[PDB]
Amino acid sequence: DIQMTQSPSSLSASVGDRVTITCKASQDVTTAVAWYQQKPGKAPKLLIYWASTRHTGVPSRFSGSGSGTDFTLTISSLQPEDFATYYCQQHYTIPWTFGGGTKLEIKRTVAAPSVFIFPPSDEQLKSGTASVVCLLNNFYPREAKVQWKVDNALQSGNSQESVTEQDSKDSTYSLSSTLTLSKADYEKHKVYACEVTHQGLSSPVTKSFNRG
Amino acid sequence: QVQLVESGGGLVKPGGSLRLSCAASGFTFSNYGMSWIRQAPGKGLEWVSTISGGGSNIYYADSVKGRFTISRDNAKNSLYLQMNSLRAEDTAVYYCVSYYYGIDFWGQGTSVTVSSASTKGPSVFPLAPESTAALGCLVKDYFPEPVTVSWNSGALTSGVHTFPAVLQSSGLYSLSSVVTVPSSSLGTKTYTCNVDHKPSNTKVDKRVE
Amino acid sequence: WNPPTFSPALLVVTEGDNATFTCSFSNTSESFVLNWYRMSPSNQTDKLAAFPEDRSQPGQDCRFRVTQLPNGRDFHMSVVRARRNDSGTYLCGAISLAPKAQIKESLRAELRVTE
């Protein structure tokens, strides 16, 4: 069972850039490596097979090379339609296996998030649960840290977050983090805070409210 | 053109069974190998099983061996996946594909969801608290995916972000939709999120203040 | 598995007539593709035809045809209405797809198209 490791996990680039992504097999696959493009909500499409053969109808800027265990896919001059996820696959031996993928994203200038905190509604509290929501709006790059603190106590396994794909207009990301408590536990505490760290900020920003 | 069309996906309880079908056209079916590839939500591609043109060479991924059976009917240009003893991690989009050098033709896939949850509409709660303010709706505890959210019946689109749902440990999904607007608007304009959940025939308007 | 054979080693035909090579390949499975190649002047191999055909290449050169013979081992690879410029070096190759993909070429043969 041959394992395929792709790198990098994501890459930011601009239209016109030369980009090269890597795929490494855990053992020899000769030249039997294929590459695929996938866009959100669509099936993958074949780009390259037998390591270096461009598939019919694929633009000429796509090329592939490598052998044994080391393989690359190169886009000579990135076009807007090329931002997408790329997967390598070995077609050498059953079981056929795929790399984890490389997401090609649009480079832009660093942008700090605007941060907002929302207390639970009275409607939800009447139902026995309390969700507290922290929103990070229109930031770049994707990497951010969100920490929940309740009366200074750092929270651990009671939150979940979700991130949007890059905005079609400004190429930024937004993120929601939701802290979920029972009503009784929520009413045990006073100060609810979400502390956000991001490259575009000179320091963490803390947004908080007082339950009373 | 070469065309591959899948059907049969749906909701099944853990331990249950489901049969996927794929209709092929635009090539001599019996001369080409066929395969099933799957993609769990937010994850990568995983090969499931392969069957040669004549149907005598058959291979399975270890994760599905003993539970899934691949087969084909060359007189009907058809490919099948019989999935028994389904597990939660079999939840995925399943693509019928054909291969040559690599996988050259893909169907657009059929979704399979394996969960003990039952169909349930969401509760919609308001999210309410510089020149800019944020508002939102929390769309909580629904099953299955998807929900659609609009704002002010579609009149408000700029600055809206509707987040990908997260699956909770309860087996129900939850998501938020937010919008940023000028701060001065928070006392003059009304803001209503409209949430549609067709699996439960739910339509909810929630005023946010 | 053993590489395919490609015969005859020397095929001589008259321009306008048909020229038929035989690629022979003992298949231990259904999971093979048979390719027919011409050697270019730069010793680059150029694919003329394949069985099963590449579905991503519809609208091929009808002058180069592959016919499966009934024993399932032998394949006719035919130049229809040979031209003097078809004289050169030809071969066939077998590519296994599963359970292990690999490529094996036949020995090369010469086609001579006379006036």
Author numbering:
A (entry chain L): 1 to 212
B (entry chain H): 1 to 129, 136 to 215
C (entry chain C): 32 to 146
Pull verbatim passages from the article behind this deposition.
Programmed cell death 1 (PD-1), also known as CD274 is a co-inhibitory receptor expressed by all T-cells during activation and other immune cells (NK, B cell). Upon binding to its ligands PD-L1 (B7-H1) and PD-L2 (B7-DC), PD-1 regulates T-cell effector functions during various physiological responses, including acute and chronic infection, and the maintenance of immune tolerance. PD1 is made of an extracellular immunoglobulin-like binding domain, a transmembrane region and a cytoplasmic domain containing an immunoreceptor tyrosine-based inhibitory motif (ITIM) and an immunoreceptor tyrosine-based switch motif (ITSM). HLX10, a fully humanized IgG4 monoclonal antibody against PD-1 receptor, increased functional activities of human T-cells and showed in vitro, and anti-tumor activity in several tumor models.
The crystal structure of human PD-1 ectodomain domain (residues 32–160, S93C) in complex with HLX10 Fab fragment was determined and refined to a resolution of 1.78 Å, with Rwork and Rfree values of 0.16 and 0.20, respectively. The space group of this protein complex crystal is P1, with one hPD-1/HLX10-Fab complex molecule in each asymmetric unit. The structure shows that HLX10 Fab adopts a typical β-sandwich immunoglobulin fold structure with the conventional intra-molecular disulfide bonds (LC: Cys23-Cys88, Cys134-Cys194; HC: Cys22-Cys96, Cys143-Cys199). The complex formation buries an interaction surface area of 1042.8 Å2 on Fab fragment of HLX10, which is similar with the common value observed in other antigen/antibody complexes. All six CDRs of VH and VL of HLX10 Fab contributed to interaction with PD-1. however, LCDR1 have the least contact with hPD-1, where Thr30 forms a hydrogen bond with backbone oxygen of Ala132 of hPD-1 through a water molecule. The binding interface is formed by residues in three loop regions in PD-1, such as C’D loop, BC loop and the FG loop. Most prominently, Arg86 of hPD-1 which is in C’D loop provide a key part of the interaction. It forms two salt bridge with Asp104, two hydrogen bonds with Ser98, one hydrogen bond with Tyr99 of HCDR3, while it also forms a π-π interaction with Tyr32 from HCDR1. Notably, our hPD-1/HLX10-Fab structure indicates that the epitope recognized by HLX10 overlaps largely with the residues in PD-1 responsible for the interaction with PD-L1 and PDL-2. Six residues (Asn66, Lys78, Ile126, Lys131, Ala132, and Ile134) of PD-1 participate in hydrogen bonds and hydrophobic interactions with both HLX10 Fab and PDL-1.
